[PDB]
């Protein structure tokens, strides 16, 4: 199944405050009006990672509660794992033989801890440092991602030094999610008076955007 991403997947490109300015930046972004793949949770196939992932989901009580990243995923290499249990967020890199599809039942190379809504995330791995950005918003469309704008805020940056080519989400067991791939693009970003990014242009989408 497929959907148009519209203008979703913008994030703050660096840790610098700016305001009332049209900044321009080149980075891995989800292209405007890209064609992105839709999945129902009634499954979690292994998916390619390419250069980075935009991931989004819509479930009534959060069924998507983690991810595996790596190349084999099964911990026969250093495999990154992320899970949240509504008390903590728990993050690991491990080679111990945990299960091949470890749904949340309702070497420790690194470790760290900390349709009612749309939940959005961006995952990227430049220099082997695993970066996570996110947003949550009360929007209630079931089929497609909602046409509109919001900027994803950086949560986490893990200096793991590790290779990834595939990923797989983890489900709560005893609801839908969308996946799209980042590409190296130039953007123009509109920073508001209060420093929020409130609009953007994809400078390679079409001749009008290249003019802007």
């Amino acid at each position: 199944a497929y959907t148009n991403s519209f203008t979703r997947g913008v994030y703050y490109p660096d840790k610098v405050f700016r305001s009332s300015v049209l900044h321009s930046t080149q980075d891995l972004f989800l292209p405007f009006f890209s064609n992105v793949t839709w999945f129902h949770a009634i499954d979690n196939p292994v998916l390619p990672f390419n250069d980075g992932v935009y991931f989004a989901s819509t479930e009534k009580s959060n069924i998507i509660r983690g991810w595996i990243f790596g190349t084999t995923l099964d911990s026969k290499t250093q495999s990154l794992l992320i899970v949240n249990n509504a008390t903590n967020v728990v993050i690991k890199v491990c080679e111990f033989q945990f299960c091949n599809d470890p749904f949340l039942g309702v070497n420790c190379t690194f470790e760290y801890v900390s349709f009612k809504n749309l939940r959005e995330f961006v995952f990227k791995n430049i220099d082997g440092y695993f970066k996570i950005y996110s947003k949550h918003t009360p929007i209630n469309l079931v089929r497609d991602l909602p046409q509109g704008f919001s900027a994803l805020e950086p949560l986490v940056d893990l200096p793991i030094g590790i290779n990834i080519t595939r990923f797989q989400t983890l489900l709560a067991l005893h609801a839908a999610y969308y996946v799209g791939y980042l590409q190296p693009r130039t953007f123009l970003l509109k920073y508001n008076e209060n420093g929020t990014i409130t609009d953007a242009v994809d400078c390679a989408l079409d001749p009008l955007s290249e003019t802007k």
């Binding site: 703050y12 405050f17 700016r18 305001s19 805020e153 200096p159 030094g161 420093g195």
Partner: protein
């Protein structure tokens, strides 16, 4: 001295620039761990060069002089930083890469180099920023009968990219022979052991290397020199250093809504405009120290050596004293009237001499006011005339210079 003359004519002359000097130097760093470089440089055993070991260094204060002062090191080459400066700096993270290597081969551990270690064991980026430390390790790493535990890659299909690493033992192909996973004519195992014996000559002896890569960014620093912080100062011209960001200016509290992850702030033209204090976490706006120009206002020295000064664009609190819209004006008797302009100052202000022994400054006269005697049936007609001769001067040409470009540049 500006005009290269002992006599100066009536006018306004931009002689010098003025700027406010900084009063004090402010140093700010996180209140954070004397750094575990000892756990790298004094480790009992180092890696094989084909399988080099990287340690992340972070969240620490590092006295690099413990390294660069020591006689224990045979080489300390450094690129994009000079090693005596490292105690003043701050970095996001540092990566320490460590191994044993044959002593002759150490010359390959630099940016832009080529040779079997650089090509197939450990490749630096050619835009590296970091230091390479090396020492003779013969008494640590050589042994009687030879130490075989240390190896290098002799063969690969293709060279390493910067900080690429390769573990594989699979058979190399040196010709047309298909190797099928076994040695033979032009088919060989890709790794060789050094076998270090203490009898070997210095170029054949084992050496230890540590390479420090500095993660220099405008992101928050987690590795820093031992340099101590000062207290903070506000609303005053100071020199400053935040996490190794040196600058000069006035520091002031501000309303800028930094989001919780944001560390620095910037202007429309991409200058640093604000920071958050690494200890206090307050947002401080930065504005440059005040400056402008020193336009000296003079009648001719053939009339008088008395002078006035305009601190151009400056406010008089930052330098009789009179605040014009053009800047702070300093002299005496800057008195309220109007006259035609003698010397211009700007924004309708002009200045002129009184021989009562003073330079006036005044708002300029545009001319005498005249209500014309108009009414709808009155005309004025001239009873008489005057023939007037008006001299107009115009430039028409200028001196026909020419320059021999070869004789000017090279002098024959």
């Amino acid at each position: 001295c500006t005009l290269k003359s002992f006599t100066v004519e009536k006018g306004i002359y931009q002689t010098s620039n003025f700027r406010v000097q900084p009063t004090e130097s402010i140093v700010r760093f996180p209140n954070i761990n004397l750094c575990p470089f000892g756990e790298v440089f004094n480790a009992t055993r180092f890696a094989s060069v084909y399988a080099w070991n990287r340690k992340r260094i972070s969240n620490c204060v590092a006295d690099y002089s413990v390294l660069y002062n020591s006689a224990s090191f045979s080489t300390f080459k450094c690129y994009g930083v000079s090693p005596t400066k490292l105690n003043d700096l701050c970095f996001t993270n540092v990566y320490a890469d460590s191994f044993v290597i044959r002593g002759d081969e150490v010359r390959q551990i630099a940016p832009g180099q080529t040779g079997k270690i650089a090509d197939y064991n450990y490749k630096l980026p050619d835009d590296f920023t970091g230091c390479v430390i090396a020492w003779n390790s013969n008494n640590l790493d050589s042994k009687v009968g030879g130490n075989y535990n240390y190896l290098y890659r002799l063969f690969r299909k293709s060279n390493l990219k910067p900080f690429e690493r390769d573990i594989s033992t699979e058979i190399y192909q040196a010709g047309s022979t298909p190797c099928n996973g076994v040695e033979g004519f032009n088919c060989y195992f890709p790794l060789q052991s050094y076998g270090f014996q203490p009898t070997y000559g210095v170029g054949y002896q084992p050496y230890r290397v540590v390479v420090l890569s500095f993660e220099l960014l405008h992101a928050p620093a987690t590795v820093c020199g031992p340099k101590k912080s000062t207290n903070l100062v506000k609303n005053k011209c100071v020199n400053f250093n935040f996490n190794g960001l040196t600058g000069t200016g006035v520091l002031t509290e501000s309303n800028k809504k930094f989001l919780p992850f944001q560390q620095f702030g910037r202007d429309i033209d991409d200058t640093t405009d604000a920071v958050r204090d690494p200890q206090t976490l307050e947002i401080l706006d930065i504005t440059p120290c005040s400056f402008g120009g020193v336009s000296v206002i003079t009648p001719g020295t053939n009339t008088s050596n008395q002078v006035a000064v305009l601190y151009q664009g400056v406010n008089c609190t930052e330098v009789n004293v009179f605040q014009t819209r053009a800047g702070c004006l300093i002299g005496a008797e800057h008195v309220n009237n109007s006259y035609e302009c003698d010397i211009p100052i700007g924004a309708g202000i002009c200045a002129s001499y009184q021989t009562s022994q003073s330079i006036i400054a005044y708002t300029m006269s545009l001319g005498a006011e005249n209500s014309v005697a108009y009414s709808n049936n009155s005309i004025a007609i001239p009873i008489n005339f005057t023939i007037s001769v008006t001299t107009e001067i115009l430039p028409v040409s200028m001196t026909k210079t020419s320059v021999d470009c070869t004789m000017y540049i090279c002098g024959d």
